[PDB]
Design a protein around this ligand. Structure first.
Ligand code: FES
Length: 132
């Protein structure tokens, strides 16, 4: 019975828990990552003001945050498109752009999440008749 059984459809199986770090423009604070939780969900408990708190709302332009050099490297790198896109920015690293949905795993051990961008707040809007 030569079989592989390597791949599985049970991603819910989260490994041991780890600890992460929340770095902001003001300072960096410690964060605890528990199996079954999420980074964005952690920042809420620790108090870190992580950009998000949205569940498919309309207030969403683009998601781009800075992540650990190595953590992001192994986590995955951008493609040609994202390469030139970010390459156009001033001293912009591919680790500055990412999605908006991650889980807590062993690979997140000592993971550093740098949030250079600011959080959403009271701000007028409507001055966009013909946005290029
Ligand atoms: S969750 Fe709203 S832009 Fe990322």
């Amino acid at each position: 019975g030569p079989g592989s059984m390597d791949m599985f459809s049970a991603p819910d199986r989260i490994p041991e828990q780890i600890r992460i770090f929340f770095k902001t423009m003001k300072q960096v604070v410690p964060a605890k990552a528990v199996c079954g939780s999420t980074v964005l969900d952690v920042a809420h408990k620790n108090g870190v003001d992580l950009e998000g708190a949205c569940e498919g709302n309309l207030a969403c332009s683009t998601c781009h945050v800075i992540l650990e050099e190595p953590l992001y490297r192994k986590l995955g790198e951008p493609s040609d498109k994202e390469y030139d896109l970010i390459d156009q920015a001033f001293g912009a690293t591919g680790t500055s752009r990412l999605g908006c949905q991650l889980r807590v795993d062993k690979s997140f051990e000592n993971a550093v999440f740098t949030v250079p961008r600011a959080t959403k707040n009271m701000a007028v809007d409507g001055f966009k008749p013909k946005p290029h």
